[PDB]
From Swiss-Prot, chains A, B:
Pfam families on file: TIM
Subunit field text: Homodimer.
Keyword terms, alphabetized: Cytoplasm, Gluconeogenesis, Glycolysis, Isomerase, Lyase
Active site: 92, 162
Entry's EC annotation: 5.3.1.1, 4.2.3.3
Protein name: Triosephosphate isomerase
Record's function text: Triosephosphate isomerase is an extremely efficient metabolic enzyme that catalyzes the interconversion between dihydroxyacetone phosphate (DHAP) and D-glyceraldehyde-3-phosphate (G3P) in glycolysis and gluconeogenesis. It is also responsible for the non-negligible production of methylglyoxal a reactive cytotoxic side-product that modifies and can alter proteins, DNA and lipids.
Coiled-coil blocks: none
SUPFAM superfamilies: Triosephosphate isomerase (TIM)
Pathway named in the protein's UniProt entry: Carbohydrate degradation; glycolysis; D-glyceraldehyde 3-phosphate from glycerone phosphate: step 1/1; Carbohydrate biosynthesis; gluconeogenesis
Length: 245, 245
């Protein structure tokens, strides 16, 4: 399983500062063993695909569930593919809890994006109240069931565990907390899909991953990489990419 | 009061077909007395502003309420200005009824977009079961109030009445129907805001405007233009632009 780190740039940047960040990534020594994708805001998807070295992937931060139609403010897998991006992030906790996207809806978005030929970074995660109530395993199995049910070919899906209490707060999952649910997810996938899907699907972690804590998280056996938020806007994103080296 | 034709492409297009369309608009003999804007997918806004003639406005179909942050999937007024687009469409019916945007959110996004110096095409419109219950006027005044309370400067606001029973249905309002609620809107404005605002503010109609029914609606006294959807993807858009012709 090739190490995967995506940078989720969320609602950040302008053309000046993202051209500056992209020039850093392009000219930096980045490990050939790491798959790297940047999630630009939709308004700069085209410009990021035009400026980033081809070996770096571009992902869209959200997309809708049909190719075209009367849905003011949305964009589809067809437009993302037209601009030359190869990925879409779906199910992100901000889309679930701030904008109300349900499992049903993430689910049809996953199925439509895959049928259109994109890759899907599918995000699952429990809230703090659910972890303190002890039900982390039920919540996250329910969420990857809703995804897996819509997955035909797993070669294009990367699962991203992003516990909500760790997104943007500074309160990273410890390497043992991350490890435990990542091997439970791997277990879920072996019991419910197959052993072969379980062994090759990257499960990545997200939630306050920095240059200073990444190396200990990547040493864990079932952590296949990261989906980095705030630190992907920074010079230390190169160090996170290079966490196994 | 300058006649205003907005083109809302909704979630349609790709670079080849919007490229065909934009080339027609740049070539067309468009009226000197109309202000035109095109409302392009977020993913094609930079492309649409690069390629469209400078006299034609570009509008974003949605945005959020703060300038930057941890809101995966959103774009901000700062990013839209950065690209050169001068307007945003806020509170479109599809956003309210398919995507749950309440009047409190639309009201906070209007104030933010205006604080950032963009123009806003603020949308309002009743449902058919509300028209038949005899409460159009209380609905659209409720909606307009949620916007007006968040507007410190009206020179950059265009209001768009869009009865939801008329959007993409083909069931367009008669000129008499558009005119009754637009003169009601104007009067609401002169009594709850001011005479100079009411005199000044463009109130435009959308909901199945075609080149076939546009001269009759445009001859109505308080209809200052249109926000057209499906027909703005066709050569027909040029007729609607020129519609007092």
């Amino acid at each position: 399983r090739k190490f995967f780190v995506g940078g989720n740039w969320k609602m950040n940047g302008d053309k000046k500062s993202l051209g500056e960040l992209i020039h850093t990534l392009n000219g930096a020594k980045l490990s050939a063993d790491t798959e790297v994708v940047c999630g630009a805001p939709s308004i700069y998807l085209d410009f990021a695909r035009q400026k980033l070295d081809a070996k770096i992937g571009v992902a869209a931060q959200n997309c809708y569930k049909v190719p075209k139609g009367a849905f003011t403010g949305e964009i589809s897998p067809a437009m993302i593919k037209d601009i030359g991006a190869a990925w879409v992030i779906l199910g992100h906790p901000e889309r679930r809890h701030v904008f109300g996207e349900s499992d049903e809806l993430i689910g049809q978005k996953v199925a439509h994006a895959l049928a259109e030929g994109l890759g899907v970074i599918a995000c699952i995660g429990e809230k703090l109240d659910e972890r303190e109530a002890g039900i982390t395993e039920k919540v996250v199995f329910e969420q990857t069931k809703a995804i897996a049910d819509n997955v035909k070919d797993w070669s294009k899906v990367v699962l991203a565990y992003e516990p909500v209490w760790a997104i943007g707060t500074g309160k990273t999952a410890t390497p043992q907390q991350a490890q435990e649910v990542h091997e439970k997810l791997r277990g879920w996938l072996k019991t419910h899909v197959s052993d072969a899907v379980a062994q090759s699907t990257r499960i990545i972690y997200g939630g306050s991953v920095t240059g200073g804590n990444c190396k200990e998280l990547a040493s864990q056996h079932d952590v296949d990489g990261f989906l980095v938020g705030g630190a992907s806007l920074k010079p230390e994103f190169v160090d996170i990419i290079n966490a196994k080296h």
